Amino acid sequence: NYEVSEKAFLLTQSKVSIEQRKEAAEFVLAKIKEEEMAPYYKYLCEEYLVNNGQSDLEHDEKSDSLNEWIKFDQELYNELCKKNESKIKELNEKIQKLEEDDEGELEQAQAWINLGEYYAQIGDKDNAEKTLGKSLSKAISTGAKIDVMLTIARLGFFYNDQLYVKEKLEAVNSMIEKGGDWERRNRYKTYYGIHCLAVRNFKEAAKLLVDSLATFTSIELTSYESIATYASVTGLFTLERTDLKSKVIDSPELLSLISTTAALQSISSLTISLYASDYASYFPYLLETYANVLIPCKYLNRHADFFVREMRRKVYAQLLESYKTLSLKSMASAFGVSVAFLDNDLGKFIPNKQLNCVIDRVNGIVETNRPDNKNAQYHLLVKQGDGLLTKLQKYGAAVR
């Protein structure tokens, strides 16, 4: 189910090439014939509007799109009733006999799980969790527990739920704590890192992504090649340059990801160019990272520009440590940036107190701002006194 959500996401906003939606149209048209995408197929028009969302032959009659294959027809209408019969009506008579005759426990619980998976493709989340609750009482070992974490996860990836998914996953894992192997534990931890993209936790998104193995593949929830982009972009976003050398640039699993798929261009281009202190070739590497990774991915679109901005401020800070005073013919000449545009970069970064630096107008000498004898023993030393005083006087003033 993830292969359709990744390709059809290009139908939202494409400012570069139309062929990106044309190549993705072949994947959407092929999957809707074998299986019924109607809950997600209709959700495309109800998600984003005034781009591809206005074209429909059923709910609202309009044409706005670069692709005409998103409109309903008589073929998908007949296939919608076929899924409600073979997957539901035919199984409903078989599962009813097992409930009355009382044959087995785990064998019958698997029938309710397979039935609940059919409602995910149909789009009914009420009966999907209802049949799961009946099989939850019959489940004992971890064999039936693996499909429980996916049912809640299908709301986030498929139904696009950023709220009720995180609360339900924490309740199931807390009631019965097993975890299986590391790949089963990733299914909980992968969403925790992805959920940080919606609430904008910044570096807290890659906390559980870096520790997760590169062999994690959820199929319908997520694919093998796509999950490699989340750990590569957020991994460099969180871990500093010192951690990039012993973890990112040299890894057994990570280096095998970019060799198979060349669409990453993160753990290599953004690293090796930084290790060589070359910012001239480092600038165009952000194009393939933004255009070919962040844009086509769904959850990576929540931030977008927020990614490459903090990556530039991070690499500009490393240049300030190698020289006390910089020159105008160094940053603003060989690296490709321009005096007018480069001044807008650090122009808003300095008052944010994210990076301290001095930019010159006439002579064009960039000076590195250092606390010198201040460091962390001046402002950060006295901040902990009053910072903890509020929480210390919280229960002291009001007693109980």
Partner: peptide
């Protein structure tokens, strides 16, 4: 938490970033 979330920037998207590639050959 200050000058961060909703205000954002509203620049550095495409036109400004794509212009910096032409400056390399103009030197």
């Amino acid at each position: 938490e200050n000058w961060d979330d909703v205000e954002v920037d509203d620049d550095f998207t495409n036109e400004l970033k794509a212009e910096l590639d032409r400056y390399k050959r103009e030197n």
